[PDB]
Amino acid sequence: LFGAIAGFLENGWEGMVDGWYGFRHQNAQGTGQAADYKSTQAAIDQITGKLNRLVEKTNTEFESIESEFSEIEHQIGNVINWTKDSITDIWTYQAELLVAMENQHTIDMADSEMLNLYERVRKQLRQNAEEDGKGCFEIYHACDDSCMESIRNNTYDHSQYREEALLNRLN
Amino acid sequence: LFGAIAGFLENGWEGMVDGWYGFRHQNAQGTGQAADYKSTQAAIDQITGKLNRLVEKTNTEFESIESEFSEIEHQIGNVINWTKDSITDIWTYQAELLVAMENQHTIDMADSEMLNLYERVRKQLRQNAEEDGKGCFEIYHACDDSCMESIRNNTYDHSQYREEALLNRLN
Amino acid sequence: QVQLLESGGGVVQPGRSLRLSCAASGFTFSNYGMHWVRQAPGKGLEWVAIISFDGSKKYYANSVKGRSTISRDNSKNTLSLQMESLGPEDTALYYCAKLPSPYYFDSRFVWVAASAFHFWGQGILVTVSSASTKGPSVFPLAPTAALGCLVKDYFPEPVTVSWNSGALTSGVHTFPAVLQSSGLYSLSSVVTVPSSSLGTQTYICNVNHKPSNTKVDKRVEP
Amino acid sequence: QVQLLESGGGVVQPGRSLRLSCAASGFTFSNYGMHWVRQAPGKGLEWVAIISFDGSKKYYANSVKGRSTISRDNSKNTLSLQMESLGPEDTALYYCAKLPSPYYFDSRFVWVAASAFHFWGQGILVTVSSASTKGPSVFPLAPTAALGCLVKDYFPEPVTVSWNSGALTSGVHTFPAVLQSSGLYSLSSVVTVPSSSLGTQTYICNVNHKPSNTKVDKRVEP
Amino acid sequence: NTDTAEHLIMWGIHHPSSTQEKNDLYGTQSLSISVGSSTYRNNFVPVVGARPQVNGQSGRIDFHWTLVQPGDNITFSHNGGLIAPSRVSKLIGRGLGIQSDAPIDNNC
Amino acid sequence: NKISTGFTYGSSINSAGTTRACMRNGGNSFYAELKWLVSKSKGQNFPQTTNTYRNTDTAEHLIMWGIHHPSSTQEKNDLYGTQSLSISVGSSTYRNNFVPVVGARPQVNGQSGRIDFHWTLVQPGDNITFSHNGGLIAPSRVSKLIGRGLGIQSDAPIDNNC
Amino acid sequence: HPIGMLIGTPACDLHLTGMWDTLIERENAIAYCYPGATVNVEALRQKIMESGGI
């Protein structure tokens, strides 16, 4: 478990239907919302690949060994019942294990992709801002809507505001 | 595998019976020890939920297909022996797999919770201290026992010592 | 396994102090942190106090904070509670029990377990008033059909009722108590039977009242 | 399920505007982002336009950027495309279809699914030229052995050919069209049969040409 | 069978140990046993043979059994040597069969 | 392991029956662990015979025998006479009866008559009795299976170097 | 022995009829006072041990 979905992000954004991992900003212009394409597409592709590998099954042909309209010998019938009930229990246990493990892995994979996008945005905002902890980024100088898109487009340059941030933090 | 339990923390604290993840501090007052409630309770709850989902089993009723005090027909007896030994081998392999995977997951989950608590404490000590690497935090100004509890209570404010730390690091 | 002993019950007048003490066995008491809870008559649950396995912190409830005192001894495996200035808001059933609590209130030995040691045993039923511990008055309610026994005009009310020393339990109905204008309670208890054995069987009802040492037995007849 | 309707085909002269419109059913159209693609005659695929499920952004292709316009309406479940200045580089088959696209061009309801709703339906076959919509001329190619029908000198070429109202489909060969020095196309279609039924069966070939309302039927004989 | 559930009937086929015993028990006639129902038909013929003594006796008895469904009739046509069923059995309900040697503990 | 049964028969029984279907030493022979019991005179009835085998080993033994079925009435009358043939096998854990049946059958290995082989496991300390009237294939030696082995049914050759 | 309950052997006189949710068989279970055998004895034994009354 990573500290993103069940950790420092103590609240989800139900109003963010644009994607699974998006940005919400508040600048002098006002409040705005967008979504990151890369992480959302990665999660969607992984989940769809899981589902695709899951739903495919050739299911080798089987035939009837027990008669439905006549009586079977008692001993061989008991043997068949025992075998089929054992197979049922085995498949039930494997189904439980597969479902539980796959759900855990899907949730933790969404969490990992969230944290990876977080680290990407941090590597972009390397030396011009600070992270308050609750998923937000306390920008120390400013950021325009075009600056926000540059953060989305992964084109934000920190050497352009480095000296500005240093002078604002010192004075 | 995260770099906390098997990584940069090269030694465990056998004397720390207060919890799984606790704090040890040395200030001008002396040496003190405490424990974090959140991570320990999270780990305990996850392990107990694992055990609860593990120990429950309805175990559909089965009956005897082989006689114990009389001789069974040789061919059907061989078939029953083959089937039961195959079922035994299948359950043995599944038991091995389940045990190994669950132990690996439990150890790595404890490691992940340790690293998440580490990141929480770092987000608390954002700009007033540095991490030496060996799980310790080289506080650059000071921290009282009340400051230590505030770090435990997740109430430490860094804007109160930010300028102090900056002036101590510059001069 | 689940076997206990409780003491401290009775009739305490308002203003004095109550002292309750419960001791359990069948397990290692020196590790489980214990809790004292109270339930007012009728319904409603209100927690009273918690104690660590070693007695490090109490953290009393605000309703009785600074007024009660919980303590424990692991050598004799005992848990005691003492409270003063017993107003009418303290007449309730006090349960000592082991509940799912923070981990450090328990020991490191039972952390790695899904057992979830469960408890809550029995009650105490503390009552505060002008004591006037009265003895019960029993009357036989005599005539499918039914018959019963009515116990009235006594105090307090830790009363129990059985049919033929506690044998007949089918079709029986033990009704709750009713308080009246003389500070006294009443209680009816009936049992049904087909209408073919009026003068045939030996129907006997037994009533036990503890804080008067009263044992009454009565018979029903047409 | 997979049932559609398309409109806007015909013969449009160069310089005017083409308007195509496709409407599908059997599913919720208001969520799937749709695409318009074109394929020049022969081979070669070139994408034309994409549209969001609500029409937020178009992002036209540079080959037709600023010259075409794609639009959609979710109430009537329709997708339209309008283009002007139709040069010879626009004569192609235009397919409206649902392709695997970015997720926000689709809705949140079909993200969690491995269905991958597939489409591409039929074609349109837009052609631009000096219209001169001509009627087809049919000639019976008459003598194992074979026999066929040859359709020549008409325009445009959304032509179809069947044998006995579309019954005989074995051993048939429908050959591609051939354009000649008069702006007209030709097409042969043959069928094989053993050499024992010359004057025995009723061999009939049917030719349908849509942008002339032409239905021709011919018979083969020695 | 007049019950609403199936019944379980058992019978026996005797096999003497000597010709003298056969002639004394069933005479010198040709022995034949025939069992017939709507879902079962079989024939058994007693056979004389010398066999070692088990429980002091040499002759044997082969036991047969079958399930009679509700509303069915079963007929025995015998000439001598049939072990007739005085009472037939009916199995009721389900039960767990245990084959073990450990003693019973009625307190756990 | 093969253990002799020790069965003895009177001078009226020719226990050395042979046929051209089982060649062992260039002459007519029979199965090695069995013996064919016929009448010494070519037209007389086979005498009512009783034989008893008693297992004296600490392990179970495996006994096989055969029931003959002639191909014609003439062969039956020549081998066992015109009497009614009856064979009875009896032990403490096994009891059975066999009657030879005459029937016309196609030739296999040049012979039309058949032999049905039966087998059973005799437990230590048990006695098994054969009461026969003619047509019984007696076991000259019985078998004892020793130990466990892996049975393989294959066609690939053996490589004694891997 | 379970067969003695159906046939009525002396050693099963205590168990000719009854009701139960668990039937317990022993190793010394005697089924025949007069020597003999039973056809398809395993199926019948399974039917009896699976039953809960006779």
Ligand SMILES: *[C@@H]1O[C@H](CO)[C@@H](O)[C@H](O)[C@H]1NC(C)=O
């Ligand atoms: C481990 O703890 C369990 C209870 O959680 C206890 O039953 C067991 O005896 C302990 N074993 C060791 C080796 O400490």
Ligand SMILES: *[C@@H]1O[C@H](CO)[C@@H](O)[C@H](O)[C@H]1NC(C)=O
């Ligand atoms: C969930 O979405 C699927 C399609 O992805 C849809 O079929 C289903 O009805 C939806 N269920 C709910 C409860 O929204």
